[PDB]
Amino acid sequence: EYKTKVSRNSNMSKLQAGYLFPEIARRRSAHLLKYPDAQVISLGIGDTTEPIPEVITSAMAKKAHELSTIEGYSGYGAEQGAKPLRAAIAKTFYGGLGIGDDDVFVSDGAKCDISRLQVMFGSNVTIAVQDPSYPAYVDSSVIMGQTGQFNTDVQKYGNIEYMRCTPENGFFPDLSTVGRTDIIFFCSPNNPTGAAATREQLTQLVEFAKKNGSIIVYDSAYAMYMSDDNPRSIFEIPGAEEVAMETASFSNYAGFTGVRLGWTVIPKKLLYSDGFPVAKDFNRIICTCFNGASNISQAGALACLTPEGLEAMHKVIGFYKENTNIIIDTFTSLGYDVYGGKNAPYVWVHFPNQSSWDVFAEILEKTHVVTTPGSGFGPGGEGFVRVSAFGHRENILEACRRFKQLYKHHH
Amino acid sequence: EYKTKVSRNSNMSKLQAGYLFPEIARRRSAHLLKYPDAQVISLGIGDTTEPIPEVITSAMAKKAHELSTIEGYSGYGAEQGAKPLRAAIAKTFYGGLGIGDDDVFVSDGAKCDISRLQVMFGSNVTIAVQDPSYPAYVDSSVIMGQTGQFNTDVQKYGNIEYMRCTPENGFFPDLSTVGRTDIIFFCSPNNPTGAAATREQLTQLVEFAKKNGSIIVYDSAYAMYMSDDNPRSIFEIPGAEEVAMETASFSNYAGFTGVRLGWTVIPKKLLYSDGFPVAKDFNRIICTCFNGASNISQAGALACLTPEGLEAMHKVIGFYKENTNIIIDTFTSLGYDVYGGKNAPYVWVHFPNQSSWDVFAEILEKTHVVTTPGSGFGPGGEGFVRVSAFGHRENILEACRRFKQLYKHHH
Ligand SMILES: Cc1ncc(COP(=O)(O)O)c(/C=N/[C@@H](CCC[C@H](N)C(=O)O)C(=O)O)c1O
After folding, report:
1. A154 and A77 in one domain?
2. Are residues B222 and B346 in the same domain?
3. Residue B274 C-beta-side C-alpha neighbours within 13 Å
4. Are strands A346-350 and A384-388 parallel, antiparallel or unpaired?
5. What are its GO cellular component terms (chains A, B)?
6. Which end of chain B has the smaller Cβ count within 10 Å, N or C?
């Protein structure tokens, strides 16, 4: 067989396995080949299940129709996003926090922004992450060449600061033990633990970043699930404007997981060590590596940020929060230590004396329910399993009845 | 002012100026301040102007409506794209060329794929580009760290092989003079020259890549504009499957510039020097750095690849080809050497003994028509101006009458 003389990217070689979520999808698919008539309930991947509200879909359909008319047709959009959408995001989520329309960059989703930010930061920065956390932060770091190899003793990529988050520390790290890095990826409410940082904790985080001269990338993808009275934006913390940016999405708010619309906010006062504004480099990346979010998706997002849109999103969110309560109650009644579920649409269940992959496989084989192994979220996730609350009500109820039946005589 | 201690990405510092098209927008705005009553006609950026065909927008509106129903709702899609869409692309454009559904990756656009491919290849590859060519190839290369500094004497970034395409070589590189690189970006029909490589030329290109052990990234985003009997896909050349991938888009075919939908094809036989299949690394990038194209945009693209959709796209393309003929005839009658136009919806006009930025400024100043200076596409573009044929018919006719008024005394 012929091979080129092009050397494979050594950063790709570093990755220890495939990306987590397609591996879960693969295992689900394998299970269905084994048992074609299994009534599988999927609570692994955090995939929304309920329909998008009609007020929002009607806006998208209207835009689609408009694109077939002379007056209503539009081509390329500004890569940063339509001005009225940037304005709506700025006022709805950041009104009173000193965020301008020009500080908002509309994306086709938070996952995509994480990687474009990583291209922007480049190969020479060091990163810190919560341990456990959503695996895109670590994997994008590896891809960009910010890391060393995977160390199998500790299950960590070299040169990444893994900030230990545990039940005993309330899932917020002891910052006195955290080494200095250039970037700190911080998710609140955290995926997978569900932990929402308090105002006091976020104040610590901003103070830590300021003293270390670090940039915080704050992922607020689940913030509208907040029930406790905690900040939903990092910009609620005075001084955050000098050290932080925020990335978020409509995925979990409007069921836009397939529609694709999010945003990143980079404040004017966020500067590199040479005084160059970080937002100006992000703008160059967005203008060079991207051609903007879909015009139909943008029209949908604009409809979200209206009284009817916000009401509709609130209802969807509330439904999933009720699902979460059902799941918490099930695992609590079975005698497990259960974390999260208060401020986020997933629950974080401790399974002592078992590997999380083994628990995942057992649950899938015996109950035909898909979950996510905690170790997929980093070494601090070992011994835990994440259960998503996204599902039709009857599916959540059925999954819980299956869990109870499996575990009630043990557990 | 507070500054972080994070160093600006030194690859971002290498960039000479902003991205070309935002720079043109800036000059258009300045022109409007100078002439507030000017009736500006834009033939600069290749932005489609005519409405999307109803058969296609109807499918998109239908998908939007379906998302508000239990049965019709879908959340995350596989990052690679819906299987029926992958299948439709593979058969419609590559049937008989040995391309499988699994070799096709659906994107939110060709521009985005260029940069995801560059993340995949990484910082250690060297690239070759046509000179002139679409500026994203060079700029993405600089951003990824594949280059040295910009040299102002020659107007080139160090470490890029600029393959000069000129009237004297029929706008195809003299490959015997081209140095070996890892990657060869090759656009046919070329943007900005309009030149479509012949079967013989593409055969030379594949042979060159095979002997050098290079990967060709073949950009076919204007291939449906082909009028001459030339190959529309690199995979028409036997052996291409060992050295080439292809990237394309619906932007210029269906007016999807704002809708966002393209694809990349990477064949099974394309391997790195260690035998590792390139498609497997692209798949990792697509699954880690992307969350899939918009579901509504995918529904639109599926509708394009039907008898009614293909007929509709043919009509759209035919309209722009007629605009192109109007422009060609205008410049030819004025005594200019006009290139391109035959196989692409833009024309490449030779303005010898002038700087292209000066010609751009002159045309904009005197006729209120925006064009694109050739030097924006690299140093080989100096002395030419690209004129886009995307416009309403009356706007094309008017721009041409303005050109005739400006240039009547030149020949
Ligand atoms: C903290 C956090 N940030 C960003 C995202 C992705 O948001 P988006 O691209 O806007 O849909 C997510 C989504 N995570 C889901 C969905 C994972 C599968 C999806 N395909 C993905 O890779 O994001 C999960 O953890 O189950 C997230 O948790």
Report:
1. yes
2. no
3. 7
4. antiparallel
5. chloroplast; chloroplast stroma; plasma membrane
6. N
Residue among B122, B125, B272 whose CB faces A3 most closely: B272
The domain that holds A90 is classified in CATH as 3.40.640.10
Q: Name the residue among A112, A58, A34 with its Cα closest to residue A365.
A: A34
What angle (nearest 5°) sits at the alpha carbon of residue A270, between those of residues A265 and A274? 140
Whether residue A53 contacts residue A316, with contact meaning beta carbons closer than 8 Å, is answered with yes
Q: Tell how far CA A296 is from the center of its chain.
A: 23
Cα→Cα distances A57→A77, A316, B67, B195, B295, Å: 20, 14, 7, 43, 12
Range of the domain at B216: 50-305
Please enumerate in sequence order all residues whose Cβ is within 8 A of that of A101, keeping only pairs 6 or more positions apart, or say none.
A83, A86, A87, A90
How many Cβ atoms sit within 10 Å of the Cβ of residue B253?
Answer: 24
Q: Provide the chain A residues 137-166 that lie in CB contact (below 8 A) with chain B.
A: 139-140, 143-145
Is residue A134 a known part of a binding site?
Answer: yes
Q: Under a CB-based contact definition with an 8 Å cutoff, are residues B396 and B322 in contact?
A: no
B37: β partners: none
Burial call A278-304: b when 16+ CB within 10 Å, e when fewer: bbebbbbbbbbbbbbbbbbbbbbbbbb
Q: Which chain A positions have a beta carbon within 8 Å of B388's beta carbon? A: none
SS (H, E, C) chain B: CCCCCCCCCHHHHHCCCCCHHHHHHHHHHHHHHHCCCCCCEECCCCCCCCCCCHHHHHHHHHHHHHCCCCCCCCCCCCCCCCHHHHHHHHHHHHCCCCCCHHHEEEECCHHHHHHHHHHHHCCCCCEEEEECCCCHHHHHHHHHCCCCCEECCCCEECCCEEEECCHHHCCCCCHHHCCCCCEEEEECCCCCCCCCCCHHHHHHHHHHHHHHCCEEEEECCCHHHCCCCCCCCHHHCCCHHHCEEEEEECHHHHCCCCCCCEEEECCCCCECCCCCEHHHHHHHHHHHHCCCCCHHHHHHHHHHCCHHHHHHHHHHHHHHHHHHHHHHHHHHHCCCCEEECCCCCEEEEECCCCCHHHHHHHHHHHHCEECEEHHHHCHHHCCEEEEECCCCHHHHHHHHHHHHHHHCCCC
| Residue contacts between A and B (CB atoms, under 8 Å) | 319
Total domain count, chain A: 2
Residues A217, A327: one domain?
no
CA distances from B319 to A347, B141, B330, B393, B403 (A): 56, 35, 17, 9, 21
| Cβ-contact B158, B16 below 8 angstroms | no
What technique determined this structure?
A: X-ray
Regarding whether B314 and B254 lie in a shared domain, the answer is: no
In chain A, DSSP finds a helix count (H) and a strand count (E) of: 13, 15
Chain B contact present for A410, CB below 8 A: no
Q: Which residues contact B207 (CB under 8 A, 6 or more apart)?
A: B239
Atom of ligand 1 nearest to the CA of A136: 22
Establish if B381 belongs to a structural domain.
yes
Q: Name the residue among A25, A68, A182 with its Cβ closest to that of B6.
A: A182
Domain endpoint, select from A289, A305, A321? A305
